[PDB]
From a paper:
The proline-rich antimicrobial designer peptide Api137 inhibits protein expression in bacteria by binding simultaneously to the ribosomal polypeptide exit tunnel and the release factor (RF), depleting the cellular RF pool and leading to ribosomal arrest at stop codons. Separation of cellular extracts derived from cells exposed to Api137 in a sucrose gradient reveals elevated levels of partially assembled and not fully matured precursors of the 50S subunit (pre-50S). High-resolution structures obtained by cryogenic electron microscopy demonstrate that a large proportion of pre-50S states are missing up to five proteins (uL22, bL32, uL29, bL23, and uL16) and have misfolded helices in 23S rRNA domain IV. These data suggest a second mechanism for Api137, wherein it disrupts 50S subunit assembly by inducing the formation of misfolded precursor particles potentially incapable of evolving into active ribosomes, suggesting a bactericidal mechanism.
Comparisons revealed that states 3 (C_(L22)-), 4 (C_(L22)- ~ H61), and 12 (C-CP_L2/L28) were most abundant in the Api137 dataset. To elucidate the underlying molecular defects leading to the accumulation of precursor particles, the most immature states from the Api137 data set (d126_(L29)-/(L22)- & C_(L22)-) and the control data set (C_L2) were compared. Importantly, the absence of uL22 was consistently observed in most identified precursors (states: 1-8), implying a systematic effect of Api137 on ribosome assembly. The absence of uL22 and bL32 in several states of the Api137 dataset also led to the absence of uL2 in eight precursor states (states 1-8), suggesting a possible role of uL2 as a checkpoint protein, whose binding completes a construction phase. Treatment of E. coli cells with Api137 disrupts 50S subunit assembly, leading to the accumulation of precursors lacking density for uL22, akin to an uL22 knockout. While states in the (L22)- ~ H61 route do not appear to have the opportunity to transition to the canonical route, states within the (L22)- route, such as states 3 and 8, can do so. The incorporation of uL22 and uL2 converts state 3 to state 10, and the incorporation of uL22 converts state 8 to state 9, allowing further maturation along the canonical route. The fragmented cryo-EM density in states C_(L22)- and C_(L22)- ~ H61 suggests that the presence of Api137 may interfere with the binding of uL22 and uL29, potentially explaining the defects observed in the L22- route.
Author numbering:
A (entry chain N): 1 to 120
B (entry chain D): 1 to 126, 161 to 209
C (entry chain P): 1 to 114
D (entry chain K): 1 to 122
The structure:
RNA sequence: CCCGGCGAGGGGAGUGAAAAAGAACCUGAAACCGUGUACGUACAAGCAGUGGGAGCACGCUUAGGCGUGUGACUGCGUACC
RNA sequence: AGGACCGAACCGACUAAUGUUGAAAAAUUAGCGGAUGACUUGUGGCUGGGGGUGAAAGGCCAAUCAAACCGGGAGAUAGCU
RNA sequence: GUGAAGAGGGAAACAACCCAGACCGCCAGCUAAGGUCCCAAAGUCAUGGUUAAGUGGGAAACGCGGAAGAU
RNA sequence: CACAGGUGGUCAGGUAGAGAAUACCAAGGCGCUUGAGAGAACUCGGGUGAAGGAACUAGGCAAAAUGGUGCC
RNA sequence: GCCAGGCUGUCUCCACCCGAGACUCAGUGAAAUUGAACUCGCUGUGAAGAUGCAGUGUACCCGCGGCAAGAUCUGCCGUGGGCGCUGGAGAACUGAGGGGGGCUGCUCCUAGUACGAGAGGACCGGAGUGGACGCAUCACUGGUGUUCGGGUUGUCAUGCCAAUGGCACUGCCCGGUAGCUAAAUGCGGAAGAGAUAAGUGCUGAAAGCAUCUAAGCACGAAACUUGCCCCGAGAUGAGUUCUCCCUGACCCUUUAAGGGUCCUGAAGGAACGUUGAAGACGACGACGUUGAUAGGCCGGGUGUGUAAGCGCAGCGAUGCGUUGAGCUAACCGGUACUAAUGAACCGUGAGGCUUAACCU
């Protein structure tokens, strides 16, 4: 047990975690910046980077697959049009995380996560 | 007689000509050069210190760098000792290959078992305590194939330690 | 790593044909009798294929005397001599563990006709 | 492999159909018996007339195992079910001259030289 | 007036004999909780004290071996009703 | 038409577990039983304490009943701690 | 006779076993029971005898034996 | 006690449904007052599993298999 | 009321996976008990099993998780913080001592051999092969693998068809990546050595015989210990070996294991990040731009199975070539594309007294 296993627990229902990650990815795409806890931020990056990598290639099947794990037509439309060409040269590492201290509400560590370009 | 320190890589099956499948665990055996020699007159017993691997100069402590410089060899990833069998001695910097095991046919493997968390009374003795990360030896194992030019050793059965762990292979005392 | 991959691949013979699951196949097996060795022919249907490098093994099932006997043949073991496909089938299922209960017409499969 | 109180298929013309295990021999404090081991089984159904009568208790040996056995080359022989043939402490030669289904090659034991001849289908 | 959050609370100034009288307001003790000061303790076994007791700091007759703060070690010591 | 059957709501604690601190001074989860009959409940009134009530277990009558709470006889009484 | 209602010393510990009846203080000397290898204060003291088994340092009846005692 | 408990009656949609039971949705109300962490042994509620369905237990007590229409 | 049968981890043996507690981080937080505690084992005694009395032995101080033999305390396993081994620091080991088990069946040759009138019949314990225990492992046998893929009933939603996503135990099933797993496979109960009971013995009287012993003086049971592995210098008796670092100045006093000030900050560690087949929290391992430590990317591999769209056929279900295609978490070889920045803190500045041998 605990040997060579991926995926932090984030104690919750599996479908609940999947919906949580869908919402996280949608928010990050919409606003290009999130202010969230590091334990969740790591898996948010791991789950969102595949979406942007897939969006870099334009095709009906790719768009349908992106919408399947996104469930937001506007967000999917935002993909394949701005993020894809913006990061076309770069291969991987589309997100950066900067620590901003510990959350005052419950001392929970929190950090900003944003795209490499983030503007322009 | 004298054992060598190697690195576990994995284990698979080896097919014989007659059509028999034999489990084999794979040990990479780098040339374990000797750094220091212990003697009865000075150290109180006969032994030779073996080192293997490579450590980055930045991540090597200055005392260890000086010790290896005195030994006149590059710094390895660790130091180990082996009691001599009252045979011919060795010299500092004398690289030792796997050829010693090419004509033994019986070796023993010592290593650290894979770590595990707290274990219950049933899980331990069928009280609770730490599991794994403890020295353990399995004896009376016969070498299958030896590849000196590839630093590859195949030994029957299973040996303590998962992939990437360091182990010691010594001539089988029991026979 | 590289060493284990090299060790596994150096003992690979490019002679086994690519047979789909559920495809009737014959296998030649060396068997030791007395002080000699001889050939044995085993006809059956491949149920599952687990091609883990040189550990590749496939399960072949046969009906003898009214009972079903299934044996796992190693793809690259010296014991296995050659693999020949006689009757070609086509099932859209990697594993055929379901047919253990079927018999007669139900257990039969249709021709691929590819 | 066979455990205590397990049904074994009948592979002989003795007329037996269902046989139940009662005791396991072949090693002190043994929990399982292999294909090449002697086991103690009884009879649940018997033919109206014959040499086998209901309730008799006698030795037997498993010819086929559901779990199966391994081979030196890594091959495994697996059968659809467990099959056993009754054996007697005296006159080991079983009454049945015909055996259902194939048999494996581990029956080369000293006392099993007379059974390899039967079972023509391997 | 300032810190503080345009709070609570605190620090200055003033009044006030006195704020060591601030609305929790005469006098303010122990159980309980903290800082600093001086000493003992991480090789040392039991009603945790009693005599001996070197050592560790202060002031004294400016030594003359005095008292206060602690007690390493040591003989003895099996609570109250 | 059912002391009729399965099965909601509803009712009973018949059984198992949660606790005798407690969420509850008799409650919670689950199972089980009735679920047109011998049923239940919304609202109001009556049966008062050697009395009422009771298919009799001498059961119940506001923390209990087998003599309830209140104030008094009584700061009671014999032995004993 | 002791405890009850009397301390203290010895018997390794111990209330009924031996010496012995505490007015208080003193860094003084002499004794009773018990000791004088040490632990711990005193003779490794003297003379005449037993002991070879640690019996001393646990044991009866009986022909040194009997003899087997408590993590 | 903002407690987990009891509190009398009425309003009673759509889909697949014999059904006011069953599962998702309409309008409406809510995420229930500690959150986040690698996710150990162990406890509680569950799922799968090779040789078996009663060989543990005084005990088929939990769980598990089927859950109908017309005919031969 | 009883019988026959199918039917599940109730069990041999349990293995794995999903949730709430169990452990840490920020805050709230009460109880039963409480004479005081600097709360050890054994032996003897005791109003009679003594943590407290006499004798003896062990134990550095203080914390965290359970096993409950008596969850406050005594006690056990594992693991931590402080402290000393005498200038400091990083590694490697000797080892006083400590954990445990030393089981057992069948067959083969020996061998139908010695011995034995015949009948009868081994020592052998040499080889192979089982049973039970422990350790090791997932390539093989499979189980698990709700994070991967596919089939499928109902319902809602994406403006509608197609195609997709949520809910209904993972909605119900069929397979399965990596990890873990026994039912799977590798090894061990050594050989040899010391002392040995009984027993087997060279010469041998006292007591011209005899005798294991009086003199010279030899083997030996599966019984015991080493030999087999593991922890171990907190072994305070604090060990042995290697290497590295510091080579400044000044003032005062109660003038010495004295104090103070400026400068210096060495090796190493801790601090924080990526994190791991290390882990409850600690601790441990690899790396921190002089890089493959984590993520993503490329290609491969495994798994699942012929994705959507396109055009043809059936006026419809649906099939056909595209297509052994699409997707693929934890596996493998590369890739700095992203995250591990320059730094700050502790840790010092030649190491106390005495003795004996050396060049002075």
């Amino acid at each position: 047990m605990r040997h060579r296993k991926s995926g932090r627990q984030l104690n919750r229902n599996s479908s609940h975690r999947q919906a949580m990650f869908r919402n996280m990815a949608g928010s990050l795409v919409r606003h290009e910046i999130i202010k969230t806890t590091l334990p969740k931020a790591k898996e948010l990056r791991r789950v969102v980077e595949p979406l942007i990598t897939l969006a870099k290639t334009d095709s009906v099947a790719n768009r349908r697959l992106a919408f399947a794990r996104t469930r937001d037509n506007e967000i999917v439309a935002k993909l394949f049009n701005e993020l894809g060409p913006r990061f076309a040269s770069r291969a991987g590492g589309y997100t950066r995380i900067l620590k901003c201290g510990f959350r005052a509400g419950d001392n929970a560590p929190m950090a900003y996560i944003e795209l490499v370009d983030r503007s322009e | 007689m004298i054992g060598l320190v190697g690195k576990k890589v994995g284990m698979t099956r080896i097919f014989t000509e007659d059509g028999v499948s034999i489990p084999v665990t794979v040990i990479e055996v780098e040339a374990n050069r000797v750094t220091q020699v212990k003697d009865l007159a000075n150290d109180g017993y006969r032994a030779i210190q073996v080192t293997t691997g490579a450590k980055k100069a930045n991540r090597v402590t200055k005392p260890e760098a000086g010790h290896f410089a005195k030994a006149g060899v590059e710094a390895g990833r660790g130091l180990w000792e082996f009691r001599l069998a009252e045979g011919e001695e060795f010299t500092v910097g004398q690289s030792i290959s796997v050829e010693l095991f090419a004509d033994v046919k019986k070796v023993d493997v010592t290593g650290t078992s894979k770590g595990k968390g707290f274990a219950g009374t049933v899980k331990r003795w069928n009280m609770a305590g730490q599991m794994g990360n403890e020295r353990v030896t399995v004896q009376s194992l016969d070498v299958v194939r030896v590849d000196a030019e590839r630093n590859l050793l195949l030994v029957k059965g299973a040996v303590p330690g998962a992939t990437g762990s360091d182990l010691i292979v010594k001539p089988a005392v029991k026979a | 790593s590289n060493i284990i991959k090299q060790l596994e691949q150096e003992q690979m013979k490019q002679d086994v044909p690519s047979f789909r699951p559920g495809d009737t196949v014959e296998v030649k097996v060396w068997v030791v009798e007395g002080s000699k060795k001889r050939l044995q022919a085993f006809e059956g249907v491949v149920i599952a294929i687990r091609n883990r490098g040189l550990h590749s093994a496939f399960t072949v099932r046969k009906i003898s005397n009214g009972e079903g006997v299934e044996r796992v043949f190693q793809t690259h073991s010296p014991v296995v001599d050659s693999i020949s496909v006689k009757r070609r089938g086509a099932v859209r299922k990697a594993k055929l563990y379901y047919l253990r209960e079927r018999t007669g017409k139900a257990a039969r499969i249709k021709e691929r006709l590819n | 492999m066979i455990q205590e109180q397990t049904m074994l298929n009948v592979a002989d013309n003795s007329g037996a159909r269902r046989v139940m295990c009662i005791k396991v021999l072949g090693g002190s404090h043994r929990r399982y018996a292999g294909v090449g081991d002697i086991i103690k089984i009884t009879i649940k159904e018997a033919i109206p007339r014959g040499k086998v009568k209901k309730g008799d208790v006698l030795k037997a040996v498993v010819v086929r195992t559901k779990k199966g056995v391994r081979r030196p080359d890594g091959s495994v022989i697996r059968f659809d079910g467990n099959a056993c043939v009754l054996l007697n402490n005296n006159s080991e030669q079983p009454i049945g001259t015909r055996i259902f289904g194939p048999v494996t090659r581990e029956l080369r034991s000293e006392k099993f030289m007379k059974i390899i001849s039967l079972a023509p289908e391997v």
